[PDB]
């Protein structure tokens, strides 16, 4: 299958060179896998989700996305036009408020909620977690993401939008999750993207067009537009049978395009997520 006129980072994920505009992927499109988007929430009623998106938990009075941010991230994962995994199942966990912030204890609780929730969710192909969230270094926050990965969930996390080493940022520095940095249109690390030996992979994170609240769309930048790209690549790859929650990050790095990125600091991997689908 081929999506013609696809957002840049989708096409970049199915190509070995930059400047392409078509997105290539298997028509299975991540059916049978489920992705939990921990965040501001998800506008489940967005027609781009086609009844495949759903609010599963809030730590607030409202289970809705009154920010937009969560919706944007969930759209790069699985919306129909903007999504990597166009048929995956999306679950919303609101650990961030409408401004887009949350305390550590509530985001640790939301990670632990998925650990248990996934057992009673029909995801035959596997379960992934997308965390476009983070802050100062926390050993409880790293511990919680380690348990989540350990429960059999492919955990993808943002590197941090600081242009410094991701080692001083909370879930990012957890060595066992899949830590995602951002790249731009021209195959350069995004200027704001963190780096460090803790990163595993880079995804498109600059000028990423996706779904927004109010049944609309919006284009924004950050390690947060990059995370869900590798989160949807896992779900798609897992639904292909190529890998599973435990091995997924390793498999994505081992099959990434190598040495394509410029502006990559020494000690940081030069790997860009790739779906390996030539037609």
């Amino acid at each position: 299958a081929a999506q013609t006129n696809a957002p840049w980072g989708l096409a970049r994920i199915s190509s070995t060179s930059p400047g392409t505009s078509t997105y290539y992927y298997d028509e299975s499109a991540g059916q049978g896998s489920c992705v939990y988007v921990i965040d501001t929430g998800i506008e489940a009623s967005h027609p781009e989700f086609e009844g495949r998106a759903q609010m599963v938990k809030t730590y607030y009075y409202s289970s809705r996305d009154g920010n937009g941010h969560g919706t944007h991230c969930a759209g790069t994962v699985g919306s129909r036009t903007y999504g990597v995994a166009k048929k995956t199942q999306l679950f919303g966990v609101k650990v961030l408020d409408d401004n887009g912030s949350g305390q550590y204890s509530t985001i640790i609780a939301g990670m632990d909620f998925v650990a248990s929730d996934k057992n009673n969710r029909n995801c035959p192909k596997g379960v992934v977690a997308s965390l476009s969230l983070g802050g100062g270094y926390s050993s409880s926050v790293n511990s919680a993401a380690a348990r989540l990965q350990s429960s059999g969930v492919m955990v993808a996390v943002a590197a941090g939008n600081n242009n410094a080493d991701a080692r001083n940022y909370s879930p990012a520095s957890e060595p066992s999750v899949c830590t995602v940095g951002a790249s731009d249109r021209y195959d350069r690390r995004s200027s704001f993207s963190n780096y460090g030996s803790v990163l595993d992979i880079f995804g498109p994170g600059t000028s990423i067009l996706s779904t927004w609240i109010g049944g609309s769309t919006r284009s924004i930048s950050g390690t947060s537009m990059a995370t869900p790209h590798v989160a949807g690549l896992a779900a798609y790859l897992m639904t292909l049978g190529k890998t599973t929650a435990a091995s997924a990050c390793r498999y994505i790095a081992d099959t990434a395009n190598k040495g394509d990125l410029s502006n990559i600091p020494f000690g940081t991997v030069n790997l860009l997520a790739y779906n390996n689908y030539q037609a």
Binding site: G102, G134, G135, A158, G160
Partner: peptide
Amino acid sequence: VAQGGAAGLA
């Protein structure tokens, strides 16, 4: 982290 589109982990 959150609000409007952006990203985090730092």
